[PDB]
Ligand SMILES: Nc1nc(=O)c2c([nH]1)NCC(CNc1ccc(C(=O)N[C@@H](CCC(=O)O)C(=O)O)cc1)=N2
Ligand SMILES: Nc1nc(=O)c2c([nH]1)NCC(CNc1ccc(C(=O)N[C@@H](CCC(=O)O)C(=O)O)cc1)=N2
């Protein structure tokens with residue numbers, strides 16, 4: 049009854065019943081449209097164990113989002129290079145963004161979460177007091193009206209899409225409270241099952257822990273919903289290796305001090321305890 | 336293996352395992368966060384049979400959305416009164432919209448789908464050439480790049496939310512093509528299982544048929560994803576009546592001529608064939 053079995057079974061389902069589907073990157077995929085999994089957050093943390101997940105990257109990326117950043121260079125210097133390709137000179141130029149500085153991902157998560165509706169200029173522009181701070185609004189609504197069925201943070205901004213180096217794979221998330229517990233559902237339009245998905249699950253589970261902490265709630269469930277759930281054709285053999293491995297108990301996430309605001313979390317405030325994954329499995333990134 | 340069994344089983348699941356959850360309307364609910372169902376659209380149409388669904392309302396509402404309307408009065412005169420309460424003088428005044436004309440629902444689906452990002456003024460303002468026509472963009476993308484994993488229409492607009500008489504229950508939808516078939520996934524943040532959900536399923540199935548028709552594709556699946564899936568406490572006895580009834584085969588939807596553009600569909604272009612539902616079950620609307 050290990051929660052990780054849901055992920056492994058989604059992979060198996062795509063390998064057995066998915067359709068071949070060509071893709072933007074020219075790699076090719078096996079694909080299923082519409083999946084859902086539920087990861088309990090109660091006294092455990094869904095950091096996958098059948099391969100080592102890059103937790104440092106997960107944590108630094110989320111802190112960077114919370115700062116409102118859309119500058120990959122700010123994250124890269126942490127040793128977290130996950131957005132570097134998307135902000136590179138040549139990739140940017142390929143999308144027509146030759147005026148843009150390297151690293152400028154466009155009006156993606158950090159900007160939409162903190163400044164939705166503002167006019168994007170450059171990654172380093174001053175957006176203070178502009179647009180909707182959806183992140184803080186979610187927090188405030190959970191505190192004042194936990195029954196609210198409208199507690200959403202939405203990165204999908206049709207007006208801004210043409211400026212984004214990668215339109216968000218994570219279109220929106222919704223929070224929910226019952227019985228003292230905070231849950232989160234992610235709508236992921238496009239899930240690279242081998243590379244992005246394990247990382248993304250940890251990201252939103254971590255966000256839920258952070259928000260529960262500052263709202264005085266306990267973490268409940270993370271519900272992961274997928275649009276195009278796909279396995280790149282060059283991830284088939286790596287995932288078949290992964291599927292042979294037995295899950296180990298999920299770790300725990302500890303928050304090491306009482307933090308009052310989302311902005312105040314720091315890397316050293318977190319400890320993953322009891323994480324004993326199987327070895328890293330290299331999965332190439334389709335660009 | 337009837338598709339309707341998924342809906343009936345979601346209702347049963349909420350009745351048995353849902354949590355009590357207070358709500359905005361003061362009615363109270365039994366609630367589950369995170370559900371998903373898949374309704375085939377292949378040679379049948381998921382218009383529920385265990386009660387008669389208001390198909391005329393479904394069809395007229397969708398045509399009204401496609402016209403870009405946010406004026407409930409335009410729909411009401413069709414004998415489709417579903418948005419009238421939300422646009423009524425007293426409801427509007429209760430939300431602080433006393434300057435607003437009756438019927439003005441704010442910048443909801445018709446406006447977001449046709450004019451995302453434009454500045455909302457009144458329901459009757461001229462928005463020609465303003466904002467993003469997401470509906471037409473989806474259509475064009477399906478035709479030119481069916482593999483695209485970004486084919487989204489999003490009604491959730493954080494900037495505009497304060498002006499909406501009801502923030503969209505249908506936050507976004509995504510389209511997907513494989514094997515000549517068009518699928519659609521709805522992210523429904525809040526689902527009134529007794530009243531709205533059966534109606535909403537038919538709406539998005541109908542939208543998928545329309546878009547498949549004009550793009551030369553065959554309908555595939557409608558994937559229905561729910562956030563707060565709930566049964567109002569005063570719908571429990573009506574739904575228990577419904578659950579006793581055997582499903583009948585789903586009907587077929589026929590489109591009676593070749594229509595070239597989404598704007599050109601008319602009520603008389605559609606015929607539901609073979610629909611033999613059990614009788615209407617009155618479910619009161621929580622306001
Ligand atoms: N094709 C594709 N798939 C993605 O999942 C993806 C994408 N493109 N573009 C950007 C992006 C942003 N997120 C991420 C997340 C993790 C890695 C990644 O390379 N993680 C490796 C570890 C890297 C390291 O250890 O330094 C992994 O194996 O999870 C990259 C991008 N994700
Ligand atoms: N509480 C609540 N639930 C909803 O589902 C809902 C809401 N509020 N506010 C507005 C709204 C918009 N959609 C709809 C859809 C159908 C009906 C409705 O009354 N349908 C009846 C048939 C009405 C008739 O036959 O004229 C039904 O039983 O489905 C109302 C609102 N839906």
Ligand SMILES: O=c1nc(NO)ccn1[C@H]1C[C@H](O)[C@@H](COP(=O)(O)O)O1
Nearest residue numbers: 072215217238239240244245248484485
């Ligand atoms: O799985 C993903 N998660 C992300 N987290 O940031 C980024 C996107 N992705 C994956 C989904 C696709 O394989 C790819 C984006 O390509 P697109 O769906 O064609 O935009 O990256």
Ligand SMILES: O=c1nc(NO)ccn1[C@H]1C[C@H](O)[C@@H](COP(=O)(O)O)O1
Nearest residue numbers: 197198359502504525526527531532535
């Ligand atoms: O089920 C719904 N579908 C709609 N189609 O237009 C409209 C909203 N609803 C239901 C969900 C809730 O019961 C209610 C909206 O209340 P809220 O979730 O508190 O915003 O209406």
